[PDB]
Amino acid sequence: RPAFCLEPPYAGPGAAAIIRYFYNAAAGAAQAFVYGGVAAKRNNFASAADALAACAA
């Protein structure tokens, strides 16, 4: 499991309200979060499937 998969979700400073997904390793689940549209970190994916593929192979 790449180490980035343990990062808390990061909305960043932006004012957009975009739905993205992060891997929540404690929950063993990909979960939706709000992304502000700038300053993404790595635990940020377009879909739950993409998050699971990277982080729960």
Residue numbers in the entry: 1 to 57
Task: Cite, word for word, the article reporting this structure.
Here, we report a structural and thermodynamic analysis of six extensively simplified BPTI variants, where 19–24 of its 58 residues are alanines, using differential scanning calorimetry (DSC) and X-ray crystallography. We used a stabilized BPTI- (BPTI- A14GA38V12), containing only the 5–55 disulfide bond, as the reference molecule instead of wild-type BPTI, which contains three disulfide bonds13, and a BPTI variant containing 19 alanines (BPTI-19A) as the template for further simplification. However, the alanine substitutions exerted a small unexpected enthalpy stabilization, and the magnitude of which increased in a nearly additive fashion along with the number of alanine substitutions, which was, however, over-compensated with entropy destabilization. A structural analysis indicated that new water molecules were recruited into the spaces created by the alanine substitutions, facilitating protein–water hydrogen-bonded interactions as well as interactions with the methyl group and creating hydration networks around the substitution sites.
We mutated the exposed and partially exposed residues (P8, K15, R17, R39, K41, R42, and D50) to alanines because we expected that these substitutions would minimally affect the densely packed interior of the native protein45. The mutants were named according to the numbers of alanines in their sequences (i.e. BPTI-19A stands for a BPTI variant containing 19 Alanines) and a suffix ‘a’ or ‘b’ was added to distinguish variants containing the same numbers of alanines at different sites45. To provide a structural view of this peculiar instance of enthalpy stabilization, we crystallized and solved the structures of six simplified BPTI variants containing 19, 20, 21, 22, 23, and 24 alanines. On the other hand, despite repeated trials, BPTI variants containing 25–27 alanines merely formed needle crystals, unsuitable for diffraction. All six variants crystallized under the same conditions, indicating a minimal disturbance of the surface properties, even upon multiple alanine substitutions. The R39A substitution also recruited 1–2 new water molecules close to the amide nitrogen of Ala39, extending the hydration networks observed in BPTI-21A. X-ray crystallographic analyses indicated that all of the simplified BPTI structures fully overlapped and that the main change that occurred upon the number of alanines was an increase in the solvent content in the asymmetric units. The new water molecules were recruited around the alanine substitution sites and were involved in novel hydration networks. Thus, favorable protein–water interactions appear to be the most likely factor responsible for the increased unfolding enthalpy of the simplified BPTIs, rather than the relaxation of atomic clashes or the creation of new intramolecular hydrogen bonds or van der Waals contacts, assuming that the hydration structures remain the same for all alanine mutants in their denatured states.
